[PDB]
């Protein structure tokens, strides 16, 4: 109760006066692309003066504008530079040049959860529960700051050297006290009220946790199809079928997170997050030990040293181009 009060004060100070222009491109050697997303490319870089490795997200200003992501991109950087939590990636530097915006994060070397999940097939329930508990604590923190995260999925979750989760990609995160309306996210993870254009709040993050727990434990998402339109029809019907190997406790939790009725969805009731923390599926979870990272992780990725990228897929490399003319200067003044 008291910890979140202190956490809000550091957050508000940085929210009100964000850091800006804390490095420059020529301070880094660019090594290898770690991932591409819908919007940017993330590269492994080495900082020359310290020798440290970092993950640098590069956003092309003209592409951000074309995809109508200006405000979302400003949200992303303003929020990421203000938060501090054990399971959130740390933003170390940010800067911009004539063509691009740059966010330099701690490098999380264990790879995406996505890659390990697809390769292994599915996680056993104790393994899924270990990861789920970290997301519960992370959403408790974020929501206490009036933040909605809006893009939970294995592709945006990284495994660190100790086997714990790091949440990355604040591209759709938003600080909002009331309802919001933007249609954004990933089809498989969209809550019904987003699809139905009803206005929505932080409860969409708890729906998405339900989807993530299902996908972790089953190996496939609860609603899938070849085309997003058919995914949406399945989501709004709310009919979910469970694998035969799911425990009764897991099915009960998921029925309460994948609740189409906002007034019944766990996370959104009078007891808030405690309905989730107190559920029987989490009865063996020591929430404090998870927060303090004192629990031994069920899976520890292999690393042969700093700069090792073997837990990431290979991507085609592209040159970073910087124009002699400043692009979109006024739009990104505050970045």
């Amino acid at each position: 109760k008291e910890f979140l009060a202190k956490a809000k004060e550091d957050f508000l100070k940085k929210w009100e006066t964000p850091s800006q222009n804390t490095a420059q491109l020529d301070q880094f050697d660019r090594i290898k692309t770690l991932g591409t997303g819908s919007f940017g490319r993330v590269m492994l870089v080495k900082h020359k003066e310290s020798g440290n490795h970092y993950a640098m997200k590069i956003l092309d200003k003209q592409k951000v504008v074309k995809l109508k992501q200006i405000e979302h991109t400003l949200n992303e950087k303003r929020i990421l530079q203000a938060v501090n939590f054990p399971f959130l990636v740390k933003l170390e530097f940010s800067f911009k040049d004539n063509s691009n915006l740059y966010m330099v994060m701690e490098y999380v070397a264990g790879g995406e959860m996505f890659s390990h999940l697809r390769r292994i097939g599915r996680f056993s329930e104790p393994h899924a529960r270990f990861y789920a508990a970290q997301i519960v604590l992370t959403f408790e923190y974020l929501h206490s700051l009036d933040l909605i995260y809006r893009d939970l999925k294995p592709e945006n979750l990284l495994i660190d050297q100790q086997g714990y989760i790091q949440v990355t990609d604040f591209g759709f995160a938003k600080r909002v006290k009331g309802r919001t309306w933007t249609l954004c996210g990933t089809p498989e993870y969209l809550a019904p009220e987003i699809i139905l254009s009803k206005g929505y709040n932080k409860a969409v993050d708890w729906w998405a946790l339900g989807v993530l727990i299902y996908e972790m434990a089953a190996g496939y998402p609860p609603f899938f199809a070849d085309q997003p339109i058919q995914i949406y029809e399945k989501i709004v019907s709310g009919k979910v079928r469970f694998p035969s190997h799911f425990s009764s406790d897991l099915k009960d939790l998921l029925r309460n997170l994948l609740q189409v009725d906002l007034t019944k969805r766990f996370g959104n009731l009078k007891n808030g997050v405690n309905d989730i923390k107190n559920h029987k599926w989490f009865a063996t979870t020591d929430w404090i030990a998870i927060y303090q990272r004192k629990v031994e992780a069920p899976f520890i990725p292999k690393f042969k040293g700093p700069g090792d990228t073997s837990n990431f897929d290979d991507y085609e490399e592209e040159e970073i181009r910087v124009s002699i003319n400043e692009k979109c200067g006024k739009e990104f003044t505050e970045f």
Binding site: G37, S38, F39, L67, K68, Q69, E112, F114, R118, D151, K153, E155, G171, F172, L183, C184, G185, T186, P187, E188, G219, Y220, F224, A225, D226, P228, R241, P243
Partner: peptide, 19 residues
């Protein structure tokens, strides 16, 4: 099986956002 239907589907790779 549901697994077989998923693996044969077009959405087993990394998923992009909608906007």
């Amino acid at each position: 099986t549901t697994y077989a239907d998923f693996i044969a589907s077009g959405r087993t790779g990394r998923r992009n956002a909608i906007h």
